[PDB]
C-alpha cells in the first residue's frame, strides 16, 4: 500500500545516505598506502604432520588455546581431539548425529561443541571424574542446521544457524540469552572478536553483519560480495575482518571506516572459498578453496604469497594456532595436515 | 631407542586403542545402506516411513531387512537452502524420491499455476541432475495409486499435461507420467531410475527397496572391481 511504498522509499534513502557516507570517507584505497611497503617473500610452508583416523569428509576443526590440542569433526559420527605435537589421539567422542557441520574448542579447554543438520549445539565435558567425555548440554531452539559455534567462556556460546539467525546461549540454563536477527539468508559462519565484546557473521545473502553480544543488536552491515559468504575471520587487531565467499574472492572489511578495504582474487581462481584465517600478525591471509589447495594472501597487497597444496579433496577447514606457530587444514579427503615454515 | 617417557608410551598406546576402535566403527558403518528421503510436503513420505518402519532437524530411521540394516534420512523439515547442505549426502547408496499420483489435479498454496505434480517434477529435476548425485541411483516411489485411480475417472490428465493425447484410463496415464518423470534424467549412462507404484500392502515396498539397493550395490562393486 501507500505506507509500505513510503517505508521502502525511506529505507532506500537510508541506503543511499550510508553509501554516500562510505564514499565520503573513501579518500585513498588501502592498496595505495601499502604500495611502498616491502612485499613478503615466497611463503613455503610444508606439511609437518598428517592426522589420519577420520573416515569421512572433515567439516570443521578448531585449535585449543594452548596451540597444541585441536578438535575435528568429520561427519562419520566422531569428534577427535588430537595432540598435534605427537599426532596422538587424546579423545574420540561419538556423536548422536553424524551430520556435524561445525565444531568448537573452549578457550579454557574443558569443553568442546559440535552441531549440524540436527539443529542442536551439543556441549561435551572433557574434564570428568569418570574418565569419559559426556554430553554436558544439548542446546535446542534453532530451526535450521547449525553452521558455526564459538565459546565465549565456559558458560556462554554463540551459534549461527541456517534459519537466518544467530543466538547467544547460557549453557548452564540451556536457554537462548539473546537472539540476533536481521540476516535474510542462511548464516554460514561467525567470528568472535578478541575481546569477545563483538562478533561478525557471514550469511548467504552476500552480506556480513557486526553484532554487539550484550546489546543483541546489529551495528553495521557490510556488502560487496556477489554470492554466499562461507567464511569469516577477525583481524588480530580486532578492527577488521575478512570474508570468504562463493564468488572466488576474499574481501577485507574494516569496522571503523564501515566499508571494503581490498579484494583478494585471481583470474585462475574460480572456485568458492570454504575457510579463511589470519596469521599471527595479520600480514598473511590464509584461505581454503574448493580446488583442493589453500592460498596464502598478502593481506596488505592482495598478492598470492604461497600455495598449500597437499589435499586430494576440497579444503573445508582452516586454523592458525594462538601463538601463530602452525596452520592446520582440514579437507574432505579425511585428513588434517599441520603446515609450518622453515629457515 | 624409543626416546619416549613412560607417560608418552602410555599415551601412544591409548591412541592406538582409539585407532582400533575407530577402524572397527568404520568397518561396521561400511556394511550399511544409507538412503536419502526426498519429496513434496504431502507426497506420502510419512506412509513410506511407516511402511518400512525434538527439533525440526534431520529425522533418521533404521530398519533391518534380511541382515541389510538400512538408514533412511528424512530432510523434509529443513526449510533452508538445500545447496548449502545437500553435499553432505554425497555417498548415500540411493535416493528414495516419493511423489503423489493424485497431485496432478491438486494445486498448492500458490494458486496461479504451480501444479503440485509440476512442483515435484521440478524438485526431481534438481536432485536427479544435481552435481553431487551423478552416480546415485534414485528409487522413485509413486504413491496414492488408489486416489489417482478414483480421480482419473472424472478429472482428465490434460490439466497437468495438456500435450497428453492418450486415454483417460489409469494404466496409460500412470505410464505416461512415469515416462515424464524418468525422462527428466540427463545421466542415463551413470545412474538408473528405479520406479515402483506404491501398493496398499505393507510388505512389498520394502522388498522393492531391498531389490533396488542390492542392484545398486552390485553395480557399485562391479565398478570398483573394474569390470565396467
Amino acid at each position, epitope marked *: 500500500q501507500s505506507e509500505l511504498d513510503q517505508l521502502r522509499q525511506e529505507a532506500e534513502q537510508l541506503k543511499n545516505q550510508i553509501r554516500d557516507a562510505r564514499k565520503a570517507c573513501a579518500d585513498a584505497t588501502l592498496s595505495q598506502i601499502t604500495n611502498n611497503i616491502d612485499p613478503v617473500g615466497r611463503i613455503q610452508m610444508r606439511t609437518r604432520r598428517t592426522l589420519r583416523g577420520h573416515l569421512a569428509k572433515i567439516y570443521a576443526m578448531h585449535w585449543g588455546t594452548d596451540s597444541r590440542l585441536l578438535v575435528s569433526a568429520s561427519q562419520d559420527g566422531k569428534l577427535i581431539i588430537w595432540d598435534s605435537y605427537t599426532t596422538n589421539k*587424546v579423545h574420540a567422542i561419538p556423536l548422536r548425529s553424524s551430520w556435524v557441520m561445525t565444531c568448537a574448542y573452549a578457550p579454557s579447554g574443558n569443553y568442546v561443541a559440535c552441531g549440524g543438520l540436527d539443529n542442536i549445539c551439543s556441549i561435551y565435558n572433557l574434564k570428568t571424574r569418570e574418565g569419559n567425555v559426556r554430553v554436558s548440554r544439548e542446546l535446542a531452539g534453532h530451526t535450521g542446521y547449525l553452521s558455526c559455534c564459538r565459546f565465549l567462556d565456559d558458560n556462554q556460546i554463540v551459534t549461527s544457524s541456517g534459519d537466518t539467525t544467530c543466538a547467544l546461549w547460557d549453557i548452564e540454563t540451556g536457554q537462548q540469552t539473546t537472539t540476533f536477527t536481521g540476516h535474510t539468508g542462511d548464516v554460514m559462519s561467525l567470528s568472535l572478536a578478541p575481546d569477545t565484546r563483538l562478533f561478525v557473521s557471514g550469511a548467504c545473502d552476500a552480506s556480513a553483519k557486526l553484532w554487539d553480544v550484550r546489546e543483541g543488536m546489529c551495528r553495521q552491515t557490510f556488502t560487496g560480495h556477489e554470492s554466499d559468504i562461507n567464511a569469516i575471520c577477525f583481524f588480530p587487531n580486532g578492527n577488521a575482518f575478512a570474508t570468504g565467499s562463493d564468488d572466488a574472492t576474499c574481501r577485507l572489511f574494516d569496522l571503523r571506516a564501515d566499508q571494503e578495504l581490498m579484494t583478494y582474487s585471481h583470474d585462475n581462481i574460480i572456485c568458492g572459498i570454504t575457510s579463511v584465517s589470519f596469521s599471527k600478525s595479520g600480514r598473511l591471509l590464509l584461505a581454503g578453496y574448493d580446488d583442493f589447495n589453500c592460498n596464502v594472501w598478502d593481506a596488505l597487497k592482495a598478492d598470492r604469497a604461497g600455495v598449500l597444496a597437499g589435499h586430494d579433496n576440497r579444503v573445508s577447514c582452516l586454523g592458525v594456532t594462538d601463538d601463530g606457530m602452525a596452520v592446520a587444514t582440514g579437507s574432505w579427503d579425511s585428513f588434517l595436515k599441520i603446515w609450518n615454515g622453515s629457515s | 631407542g624409543c626416546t619416549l617417557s613412560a607417560e608418552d608410551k602410555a599415551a601412544v598406546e591409548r591412541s592406538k586403542m582409539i585407532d582400533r576402535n575407530l577402524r572397527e566403527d568404520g568397518e561396521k558403518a561400511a556394511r550399511e545402506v544409507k538412503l536419502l528421503l526426498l519429496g513434496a510436503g504431502e507426497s506420502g513420505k510419512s506412509t513410506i516411513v511407516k511402511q518400512m518402519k525434538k527439533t525440526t532437524g534431520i529425522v533418521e530411521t533404521h530398519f533391518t531387512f534380511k541382515d541389510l540394516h538400512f538408514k533412511m534420512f528424512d530432510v523434509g523439515a529443513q526449510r533452508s537452502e538445500r545447496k548449502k547442505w545437500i553435499h553432505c549426502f554425497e555417498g548415500v547408496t540411493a535416493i528414495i524420491f516419493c511423489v503423489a499420483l493424485s497431485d496432478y489435479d491438486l494445486v498448492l498454496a500458490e494458486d496461479e499455476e504451480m501444479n503440485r505434480m509440476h512442483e515435484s517434477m521440478k524438485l526431481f529435476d534438481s536432485i536427479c541432475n544435481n552435481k553431487w548425485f551423478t552416480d546415485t541411483s534414485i528409487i522413485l516411489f509413486l504413491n496414492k495409486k488408489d486416489l489417482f485411480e478414483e480421480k482419473i475417472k472424472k478429472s482428465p490428465l490434460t490439466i497437468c499435461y495438456p500435450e497428453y493425447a492418450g486415454s483417460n484410463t489409469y494404466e496409460e496415464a500412470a505410464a505416461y507420467i512415469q515416462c515424464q518423470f524418468e525422462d527428466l534424467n540427463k545421466r542415463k549412462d551413470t545412474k538408473e531410475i528405479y520406479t515402483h507404484f506404491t501398493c496398499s500392502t505393507d510388505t512389498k515396498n520394502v522388498q522393492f527397496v531391498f531389490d533396488a539397493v542390492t542392484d545398486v550395490i552390485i553395480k557399485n562393486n562391479l565398478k570398483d572391481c573394474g569390470l565396467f
Partner: single-chain antibody
Amino acid sequence: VQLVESGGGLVQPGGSRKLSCSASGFAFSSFGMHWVRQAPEKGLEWVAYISSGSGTIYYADTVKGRFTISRDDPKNTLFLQMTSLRSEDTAMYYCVRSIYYYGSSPFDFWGQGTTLTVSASADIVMTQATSSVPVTPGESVSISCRSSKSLLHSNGNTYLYWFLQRPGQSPQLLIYRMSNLASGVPDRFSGSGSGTAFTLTISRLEAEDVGVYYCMQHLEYPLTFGAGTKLEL
C-alpha cells in the same frame, strides 16, 4: 568414583592369595591400573601395573615371576594373583587408577586398600632427607625431595608426583608432574624444583593436612617412592 579391594587376610608363607578390586563410578576400561603396597609403618612401594586394554604389564623386581596382575573389564574388576608369598609381602595393598593422555592426571584416585599378613641398580632413588617436620597451624611448611637422576625429560615434563596420606586413610594425589595441582586440592599447595631437587610448599597450613607426604617419580616404570615426610601437629 570408588575402588574397593578384597581378598586380604592372614596367609601361610609360600602360599597363594588372590586380591581383587571392584571399580564403580568411572570408566574402568579406559584407565590403567596399579597395585601399590605399603608395609606396616613403612612407605609406599609400587608392585604392578596393567595398561588400559591389558596391552602392557609391568612388575616390580621383588614381585616379578610370583605376582600376576589381570583385569576383567566387562565386570569392572582388577586382580592380583600372588604366589610364593614371603614374609616381606606383609603390607596393605592399594589399587590406583591412572589414565594417560596429554594433560591427564595419573594416580588421582586410590582404593581403600586391603591388608595382607604373612605369618613367618638402575632404579631412580627418591630421597627425602627429612623424615618428620613439627608444624603449627597457619604457617608455611616446605617439604624437600631429591632424585638420583634428573626427572626432567626432553619433552619438557618433570615426572614427579606428590601424595598425601592422612592417618588411617588411603593416599591422595596433590601434585602431578611437579607443578600441576590435582583436582579438588586446595590452592594452598604448590610444587617446584628444576630437575633433581623438588619442593612442595604448603602455604598457610591448617589441620587435615597432617600426615605423611610421599614423592613418586614416573620417568621409568620401576616407579619408586620416597621414604615419606611426616607432618606432626
